Design a protein around this ligand. Structure first.
Ligand code: VO4
Length: 283
């Protein structure tokens, strides 16, 4: 669609900041309303047998783009996980955006990873933030843990200033696959990171870890919409910039909003997307 050249984008940024960022605020208000004339169904999300599988009652997975698990013999809603396919730059279903797993969905989570042939997990939340539970620990602290038919083994860990990388082997007892978890650990309990550069490095390193041809990269935070959407837009726009030297943040964001509710949840995040791209463009 309407992509603009990097040079123009770079002037456009200053205009968005100018009058108190009234521009950014108007853009994001446009994103918020972009699906207002779109009734998108989420029937499986709202089904009673599935209610315990949602971390947040108001954060749903749209039906048309939801990831389906293969049905289990025995129930009629065992295909459900709160997770949607999301497009990336020049590729459909480049990501799976999902909530932070609950103990009750650990098996579903890892089965989904197995079935989708996912090789990369991007986690952008701490387990607990400001005293509040945000995600349950769905991986082994050391050695191995069993989640249904999938056994996960921690092979190694590197802990950087702002993010942690865990290498796992996972095996379906019906260890067969490598899964790399990139875990950003310095998102503040309030608001957005103060400097984009660390996030930028995180995105580049985690995006580069993507092998041809694995399944979608799984990206989650707590709800799987705010930091998750921000990661997705930043990663996708860096792709487009590298590829065509153009950028379409607003267009892309309005597009993926049809694929999962609330992606890029706050105006601060919408602005932080631009801080990050500008640093990548200048640096
Ligand atoms: O955990 V998020 O609120 O960034 O969706």
């Amino acid at each position: 669609m309407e992509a603009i050249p990097v040079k123009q984008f770079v002037k456009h940024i200053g205009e968005l900041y100018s009058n108190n960022q009234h521009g950014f605020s108007e853009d994001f208000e446009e994103v918020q309303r972009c699906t207002a004339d779109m009734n998108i169904t989420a029937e499986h999300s709202n089904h009673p047998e599935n209610k315990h599988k949602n971390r947040y009652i108001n954060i749903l997975a749209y039906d048309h783009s939801r990831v389906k698990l293969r049905p289990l013999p025995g129930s009629k809603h065992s295909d459900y996980i709160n997770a949607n396919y999301v497009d990336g730059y020049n590729k459909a279903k480049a990501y799976i955006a999902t909530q932070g797993p609950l103990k009750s969905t650990f098996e579903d989570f890892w089965r989904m990873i197995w079935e989708q042939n996912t090789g990369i997990i991007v986690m952008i939340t701490n387990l607990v933030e400001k005293g509040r539970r945000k995600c349950d620990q769905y991986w082994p602290t050391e050695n191995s843990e069993e989640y249904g038919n999938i056994i996960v083994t921690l092979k190694s860990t590197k802990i950087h200033a702002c993010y942690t990388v865990r290498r796992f082997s996972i095996r379906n007892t019906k260890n067969e696959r490598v899964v790399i978890q990139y875990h950003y650990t310095q998102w503040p309990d309030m608001g957005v990171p103060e400097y984009a550069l660390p996030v930028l490095t995180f995105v580049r390193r985690s995006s580069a870890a993507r092998m041809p041809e694995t399944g979608p990269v799984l990206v989650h935070c707590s709800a799987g919409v705010g930091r998750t959407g921000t990661y997705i837009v930043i990663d996708s726009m860096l792709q487009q910039i590298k590829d065509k030297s153009t950028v379409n943040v607003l267009g892309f964001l309005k597009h993926i909003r049809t694929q999962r509710n609330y992606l890029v949840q706050t105006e601060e995040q919408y602005i932080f997307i631009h801080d990050a791209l500008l640093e990548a463009i200048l640096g």
